[model samples]
Target: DQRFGDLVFRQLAPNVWQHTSYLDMPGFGAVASNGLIVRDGGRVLVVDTAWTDDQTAQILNWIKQEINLPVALAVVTHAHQDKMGGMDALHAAGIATYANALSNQLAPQEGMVAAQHSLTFAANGWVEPATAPNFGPLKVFYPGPGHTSDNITVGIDGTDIAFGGCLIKDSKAKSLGNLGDADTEHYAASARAFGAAFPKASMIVMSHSAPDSRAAITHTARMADKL
Candidate 1:
């Protein structure tokens, strides 16, 4: 069933799922962003919140219907509003939030403003200071910055599930846009760090696309190199 534009959900692995939302943005072309909701025992961990409050609420409600327990954590993949805009709603519902220190610092203020201007076609939502929440067996990392200076990639250690956020895209030949917010040199270093760190990620999830092989990391790193 469709919710908030063209948002949809699909399971990528056992207890790990991917959520996608079709976005119509000027200058950016058509993009389908991906997020993840992982279940461990009775707890739920949301990887990245989508663009608006409605989109996030839709996902939260779906999770409630499917699981008996409350959401344990909401991890922001980066400082971008598309990934962190729904923090206030989740915090209001008593769901804790987590992100790299940089993301936490930017999301509440400048990040919100940037997001508002960039996603003029999308709905607006609340922004709040994010806090770290507990999620069993998931290891989060900021293996440098590819997409943005504050970009971070999360790794669910035991499952070998990596959420590359926007730092990595699924298509290798696809040119990377939205580099205005990024420091190309830093982003390149970050991509290299990520490649070195997770050379054999069993399953790599891209925020704006499908689950792909480790080659995604290499391709992204290569793009960074050229920048």
Candidate 2:
């Protein structure tokens, strides 16, 4: 059940699953992006998405056939392609897609679809506590700007798994991966904030690499300091 053709789902915590999808970029060749599937009872929450509509549809199919639970909500960590490329697929499935206000505003400008719902960000750069039915357990924190201005981290309620998306680098990363929309001026501070926000996280799931330990956050901050 872990392997579904090109998509692989690995359990990281009690009810937390990591799903990976691959994409072939012009210069990057085949790159793997990771997302999360967390079940909080009878329904599931999807964080980020596969690379394409077809791949995303495949994930939905796996969830329907294997997980057998309704995907109640979905959220993208940022407005990057790797995070929200499969938005059309999610929308087509009639799933309520949620993202930060800035991500919603930036999505359409990148020729991508905006999420159906918006999660307001508080003045301190954290998502306002969600009032949606099952969304209360998930914590969404935005640490200013790093990889992207809208990049946010999601910390599972009962578990120690933190989803850092693209703002963090994997253990083997020598450089801060993408800087196209990065905020080099404040990347280090943002990275540190992300780490501080999830001090108890044992496993950190990022967008472009394998899920790693909490050290990856420090590694990212160290790398950003060189910029």
Candidate 3:
């Protein structure tokens, strides 16, 4: 579906469409973080907002064009800026935003800084609203910490697709970055807990990298276990 700017849409499954942010950074090749649009009859759920307001605008415009239904709900997978930075934009457009309680607290503070730094090329990247509403089908099972202290995964319920956020990726050899805000010991345990929580999840969508099958998620979990 064609939207305002560079936001492109691709259907991942029957009723599941993914809107990709067309922002390509130097080291991060074609890093368009995904936000899922799930159509269930007349209701639609938008998962995860991209980095900048421009990105959010593009996605919202696209949503208007493709689906006439209102965005019934929105989910921010974690506290990370790239994931929740566009909450203000989405909320302003009348979409109800949902996030883990901790993320709702820290998102404007630390996550916003990361958002601004990542989108330095954009003019109004840092001009987001100060507060955002928080509500969710939040799973709080944790070993304490992971990618970030507040990292949590949002399960797409019946779809077998879990939005793993930055806590886990689809790569085997790639090392998960140790965020300054994360505890190393708990990170590994959190990964294992995630695997245990969603053992039947066939598809895993992370913040970056490509989507993965269940085997890949298991492999990634094993790697984290060894770490």
Tell me, by lDDT, which candidate is best: 2
* Residue-wise C-alpha lDDT for candidate 2, range 1-227, written one tens digit per residue: 38887788888877888889998989999898999898888998999978888888888998888779999999888888888989999999999999888898999887678888888877776777752335846888888899988888899978878888999888779889789999999999998898888888888888888888978998889899999
Return the lDDT, model 3, position 38.
76
Q: Report the lDDT tens digits of candidate 3 across residue range 1-227.
A: 54457777777777677777756668865665766777766767777787777788777777777777777767666676577767678767867665555666676677452221110111211111122222232232332367787676656556777667777767663767536676676777777667777778778777665677765556656666765
TM values, all candidates? 0.83, 0.95, 0.77
Model 1 spans with C-alpha error above 4 angstroms: 1-6, 27-30, 109-133
How many pairs of residues in model 3 come into backbone collision? 0
lDDT of each: 0.68, 0.86, 0.63
How far does residue 196 in candidate 3 sit from its true spot (Å)?
A: 1.8
Which candidate, 1 or 3, would have the higher TM-score against the true structure?
Answer: 1
**Better model by TM-score: candidate 2 vs candidate 3:** 2
- What's the C-alpha lDDT at position 75 in model 3? 65
The most accurate candidate by TM-score is 2
What number of clashing residue pairs does each candidate have, in the order they appear?
2, 0, 0
Report lDDT (Cα) of residue 189, candidate 1: 71
Cα deviation at 56, candidate 1, in Å, is: 0.3
| Order of the predicted models by TM-score, top scorer first | 2, 1, 3
